[PDB]
């Protein structure tokens, strides 16, 4: 979930993109555009929610660095650009949030505590 924290008057559009596991990082808008993406409008709604689905080979994935089971990429691009009226500060910020879903589960209890 991305929450925009800029002037009410400020407007623009951005493209939040998702590239499924194994695929190369989308480095261009056009590239990122082809895959699962949301076209998040700043002007209207302040908060975007992109639910990353379950596009996984194994029924259970590695929490560790593995190429057999590697995540993917979530990237944001300038769909349009940022438009600010009058002399309002031209630089604002965006916060990000992450959470799980009802179908999210875990297994094999392990630890990592040092001294």
């Amino acid at each position, epitope marked *: 979930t991305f929450l925009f924290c800029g002037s009410m008057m400020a407007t623009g559009k951005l493209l939040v993109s998702y590239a499924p596991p194994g695929a190369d*990082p989308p*480095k261009k808008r056009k590239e990122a555009m082809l895959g699962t993406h949301v076209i998040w409008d700043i002007g209207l709604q302040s908060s975007c929610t992109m639910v990353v689905p379950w596009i996984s080979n194994t029924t259970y994935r590695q929490t560790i*660095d593995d*190429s057999f089971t590697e995540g993917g*990429y979530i990237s944001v691009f300038y769909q349009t650009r940022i438009v600010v009226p009058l002399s309002t500060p031209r630089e604002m910020d965006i916060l990000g949030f992450v959470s799980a879903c009802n179908d999210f589960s875990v297994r094999l209890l392990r630890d990592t505590t040092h001294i």
Partner: nanobody
Amino acid sequence: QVQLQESGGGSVQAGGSLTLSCAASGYAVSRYSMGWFRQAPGKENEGVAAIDSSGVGTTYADSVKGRFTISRDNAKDTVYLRMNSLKPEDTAIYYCASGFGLSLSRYTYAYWGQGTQVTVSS
């Protein structure tokens, strides 16, 4: 733990060429790219040069374009930032970062070096 050892810094002359390098531990350098970020005394996080190990597709910042040269080594897991023809504006504490990849953006990276101070003495 992924380590990036920022090596190749110092106080050279205006126009004085100075190469940079970073030893990339903890991962296969090919899965990542590698770039450079400078920050002038009391200024901001600004980009300079970055390329992806696999595609070796170059990308420089507009102000540094020409004079700076980035090049990767997949054998020694090191990057080479040939900062040739330096200028008094290139006096900014440099930093290297492995990318997801690929290009000079705000931050867009994750592993950051300690920071090497280069001063384009004039």
